[PDB]
Design a protein around this ligand. Structure first.
Ligand SMILES: [NH3+]C1(Cc2ccc(Cl)cc2)CCN(c2ncnc3[nH]ccc23)CC1
Ligand SMILES: [Cl-]
Lengths: 338, 20
């Protein structure tokens, strides 16, 4: 089949689940809490063991009251509805979801290799072949998501998890949205924001392709193309219309980056008549066998070190806090459909 | 160097999402 045809069928699969979402498919007491793997403003991700199977999972736990205070109700409903409907090699679909008086719970495949962020900062930068290996998986994932009319909106190393085989999972769908037109919400991470977001224009999925340019730059340079100590200074840089590349960047890398980090939407790669093929058929991707990446048959350039199925040495240590469940239901109406 | 400027900056740790 063509990719077109593969995607069309994946859309039929997605849409059935999108229109009739799974709801209340487990309970907290079915899991043993192991370790906090990360924290957000309104929640955390923990490693848990599912007792009936002994499988390990990542459990994202969101405090309903905190979600409400941060005006993230609709975004949170988006995340759960989308994640329970998708299926792709580089995504972690929801295995289960449920809620209780206090919290929302989303249970996903656990990625034991840790955050790309951690390895990238420690090692310093990745070689071009290394960066390319990751980038290809992102390119396929976005092609999938965009075909389902989904915009992702928070690409960054912090949210690219490495699996046992050294492949990646694109996680944190907190800003993901199914939208056919343009959308307007100011969201994302300062370093990764497209100019049109910063300038409060309506925008579309082209913001994901700009974000990819930021990521590939960061992976290959070891620092992002636009940085400063404060967000406002970062936004001045992004809109300014200039980017400098490290002398070690290949000619093909720089050319790809100029076409991704392009302020002009009529010229930005991924956004043109030829769609994602402008990116896939670019010279920097010449050695990339897209079918082999999708199949996860390419040998990963780097594989994290493990000693166990729930080893967590690739994660930072976070203060372990209780998972408290109030005796009173909080925010029932807001999260009715979750 | 640009590397030295990055490492000295306040944004080498995990970066929080923003919103309106
Ligand atoms: N990198 C994250 C950051 C994060 C995002 C949201 C909140 Cl509320 C808190 C922290 C997000 C993925 N997660 C993760 N880890 C391991 N396996 C997984 N499978 C799906 C997601 C994860 C590890 C922390
Ligand atoms: Cl997540």
């Amino acid at each position: 089949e063509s990719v077109k045809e593969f995607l069309a069928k994946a859309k039929e699969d997605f849409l059935k689940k999108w229109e009739n979402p799974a709801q209340n498919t487990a309970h907290l007491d079915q899991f043993e809490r192991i370790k906090t793997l990360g924290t957000g403003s309104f929640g955390r991700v923990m490693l848990v063991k599912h007792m009936e199977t002994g499988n390990h999972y990542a459990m994202k736990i969101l405090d309903k009251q905190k979600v409400v205070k941060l005006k993230q109700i609709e975004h949170t409903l988006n995340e759960k509805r989308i994640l329970q409907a998708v299926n792709f090699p580089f995504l972690t679909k929801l295995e289960f979801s449920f809620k209780d008086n206090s919290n929302l719970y989303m249970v996903m495949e656990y990625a034991p290799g840790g955050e790309m962020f951690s390895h990238l900062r420690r090692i310093g930068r990745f070689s071009e072949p290394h960066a390319r290996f990751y980038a290809a998986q992102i390119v396929l994932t976005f092609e999938y998501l965009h075909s389902l009319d989904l915009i992702y909106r928070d690409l960054k190393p912090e949210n690219l998890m490495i699996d046992q085989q050294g492949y990646i999972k694109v996680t944190d769908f907190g800003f993901a949205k199914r939208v056919k037109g343009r959308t307007w919400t100011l969201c994302g991470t300062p370093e990764y924001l497209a100019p049109e977001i910063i300038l409060s224009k309506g925008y579309n999925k082209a913001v994901d392709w700009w974000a990819l340019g930021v990521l590939i730059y960061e992976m290959a340079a070891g620092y992002p193309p636009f940085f400063a100590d404060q967000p406002i200074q970062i936004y001045e840089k992004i809109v300014s219309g200039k980017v400098r590349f490290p002398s070690h960047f290949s000619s093909d890398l720089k050319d790809l980056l100029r076409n991704l980090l392009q302020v002009d939407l009529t010229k930005r790669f991924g956004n043109l008549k030829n769609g994602v093929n402008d990116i896939k058929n670019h010279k920097w991707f010449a050695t990339t066998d897209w079918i082999a990446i999708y199949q996860r048959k390419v040998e990963a350039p780097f594989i994290p070190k493990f000693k166990g199925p729930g080893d967590t040495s690739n994660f930072d240590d976070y203060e372990e806090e209780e998972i408290r469940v109030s005796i009173n239901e909080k925010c029932g109406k807001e999260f009715s459909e979750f | 160097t640009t590397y030295a400027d990055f490492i000295a900056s306040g944004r080498t740790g995990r970066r929080n999402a923003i919103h309106d």
